[PDB]
Design a protein around this ligand. Structure first.
Ligand SMILES: *[C@@H]1O[C@H](CO)[C@@H](O[C@@H]2O[C@H](CO)[C@@H](O[C@@H]3O[C@H](CO)[C@@H](O)[C@H](O)[C@@H]3O)[C@H](O)[C@H]2NC(C)=O)[C@H](O[C@@H]2O[C@@H](C)[C@@H](O[C@@H]3O[C@H](CO)[C@H](O)[C@H](O)[C@H]3O[C@@H]3O[C@@H](C)[C@@H](O)[C@@H](O)[C@@H]3O)[C@@H](O)[C@@H]2O)[C@H]1NC(C)=O
Ligand SMILES: *[C@@H]1O[C@H](CO)[C@@H](O[C@@H]2O[C@H](CO)[C@@H](O[C@@H]3O[C@H](CO)[C@@H](O)[C@H](O)[C@@H]3O)[C@H](O)[C@H]2NC(C)=O)[C@H](O[C@@H]2O[C@@H](C)[C@@H](O[C@@H]3O[C@H](CO)[C@H](O)[C@H](O)[C@H]3O[C@@H]3O[C@@H](C)[C@@H](O)[C@@H](O)[C@@H]3O)[C@@H](O)[C@@H]2O)[C@H]1NC(C)=O
Ligand SMILES: *[C@@H]1O[C@H](CO)[C@@H](O[C@@H]2O[C@H](CO)[C@@H](O[C@@H]3O[C@H](CO)[C@@H](O)[C@H](O)[C@@H]3O)[C@H](O)[C@H]2NC(C)=O)[C@H](O[C@@H]2O[C@@H](C)[C@@H](O[C@@H]3O[C@H](CO)[C@H](O)[C@H](O)[C@H]3O[C@@H]3O[C@@H](C)[C@@H](O)[C@@H](O)[C@@H]3O)[C@@H](O)[C@@H]2O)[C@H]1NC(C)=O
Ligand SMILES: *[C@@H]1O[C@H](CO)[C@@H](O[C@@H]2O[C@H](CO)[C@@H](O[C@@H]3O[C@H](CO)[C@@H](O)[C@H](O)[C@@H]3O)[C@H](O)[C@H]2NC(C)=O)[C@H](O[C@@H]2O[C@@H](C)[C@@H](O[C@@H]3O[C@H](CO)[C@H](O)[C@H](O)[C@H]3O[C@@H]3O[C@@H](C)[C@@H](O)[C@@H](O)[C@@H]3O)[C@@H](O)[C@@H]2O)[C@H]1NC(C)=O
Ligand code: A2G
Ligand code: A2G
Ligand code: NA
Ligand code: NA
Ligand code: ZN
Lengths: 101, 101
């Protein structure tokens, strides 16, 4: 079926946004969220899978990363690179595939 | 006996030095160390007591502070304001007294 793919480059976390934490055991929650628009819209939300295909993380603090999928519409999806506490992310990229349901 | 007093103002931790940690359970150890010279030297090392008399610390991370006394000579002493991990110190001051032994 209609299969589409792309890659989100989140870059250095200095440019990421503070976001409220959804977990009281995590603080300093930060993310680079993007609304991705499909090159060809679907009529119904496709299945999207995310894959972390680049990481550059500081060794002196724990590695803490999430590739978050927030929502999928027929025309796009919202995803983020997400970290917390004292992790330092110098780069992170998320490869993705969408497949008609 | 000859009693002397003063106050060390360490200021904002952005200007503090990274120092090697003396405790594997502490990282990001940082300090503002000063070599204090007594206005009137002693012939023997006096007793020095340190007191933390100013603190301005960020509430979003734990408060972690030490007023460290490293050494005392007849002519002075070495002390520091010391913090670690993700504590943010905006100001810290150490009042001190020296008393002939
Ligand atoms: C203008 O449009 C072109 C496409 O027509 C685009 O270039 C293409 O970018 C793709 C990523 O979106 C890249 O595909 C990837 O390649 C990876 C392997 O290299 C794979 O793992 C991925 O799966 C994916 O397939 C294409 O190869 C690339 N095509 C061509 C013909 O270049 C432009 O994107 C921007 O420029 C790209 C060259 C690339 O930048 C380079 O990234 C590398 C490391 O990834 C490195 O940082 C380079 O220094 C950097 O290029 C330099 O800096 C950029 C900003 C520009 O000034 C370049 O001319 C420099 O050489 C990509 O990441 C960039 O977004 C796109 N935009 C611009 C401004 O040209
Ligand atoms: C991707 O697209 C979505 C919509 O589909 C968009 O989110 C929507 O943003 C609307 C503003 O454009 C917002 O409506 C407003 O809501 C106000 C009350 O909250 C009203 O007064 C206004 O009249 C207006 O109606 C929608 O509620 C919102 N919808 C949803 C479902 O979220 C994205 O916009 C970006 O993310 C939004 C959540 C929001 O960011 C948040 O802003 C608040 C304070 O306003 C705060 O700073 C939050 O911390 C911030 O969210 C976090 O940071 C952003 C940058 C992302 O990383 C979020 O995931 C984090 O939680 C909005 O201002 C942002 O532009 C849009 N873009 C992205 C990158 O997701
Ligand atoms: C030049 O020498 C004078 C002394 O002759 C010195 O001023 C004295 O500083 C003492 C601290 O070393 C201070 O004693 C303390 O007072 C505290 C209560 O206020 C007590 O808790 C302490 O126990 C201790 O006793 C004296 O009061 C003070 N004396 C006088 C006559 O001023 C200069 O030090 C520098 O200036 C001081 C005025 C002071 O700076 C001020 O600090 C306060 C908050 O503490 C605040 O930040 C003010 O804005 C700041 O003053 C302003 O900025 C400074 C940098 C100068 O530009 C001042 O003219 C401004 O008003 C002290 O901390 C400073 O180091 C000393 N050096 C200079 C450059 O004048
Ligand atoms: C207060 O006075 C003491 C001396 O009584 C002084 O410490 C001495 O500094 C000497 C350099 O001036 C050093 O001698 C050198 O040692 C080298 C080998 O290590 C030789 O190649 C040289 O030929 C020369 O002999 C002495 O070993 C040293 N003595 C002691 C007992 O410490 C203070 O200087 C400051 O602190 C020193 C410890 C040192 O700082 C350290 O430098 C190393 C790499 O050189 C590294 O960056 C450390 O992280 C750093 O120490 C930390 O940061 C400093 C700023 C303080 O916060 C320390 O407590 C931390 O551990 C020296 O370079 C510094 O100027 C002097 N001043 C202060 C503020 O304490
Ligand atoms: C407060 C906060 O974010 N705490 C984090 C916790 O969530 C977890 O990531 C842990 C191990 O890496 O490191 C810290 O304790
Ligand atoms: C690695 C490191 O510095 N860890 C610190 C630990 O030393 C202690 O201060 C604790 C409670 O505040 O917070 C962190 O876990
Ligand atoms: Na490590
Ligand atoms: Na608090
Ligand atoms: Zn921690």
């Amino acid at each position: 079926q209609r299969v589409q793919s792309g890659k989100i480059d989140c870059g250095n976390d200095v440019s990421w946004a503070k976001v409220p934490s959804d977990d009281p055991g995590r603080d300093n929650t930060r993310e680079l969220a993007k609304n991705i628009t499909f090159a060809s819209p679907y009529c119904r939300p496709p299945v999207v899978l995310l894959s972390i295909t680049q990481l550059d993380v500081e060794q002196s603090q724990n590695l803490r990363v999430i590739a978050r999928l927030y929502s999928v519409s027929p025309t796009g999806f919202k995803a983020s690179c997400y970290t917390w506490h004292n992790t330092k992310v110098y780069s992170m990229s998320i490869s993705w595939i969408s497949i008609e349901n």
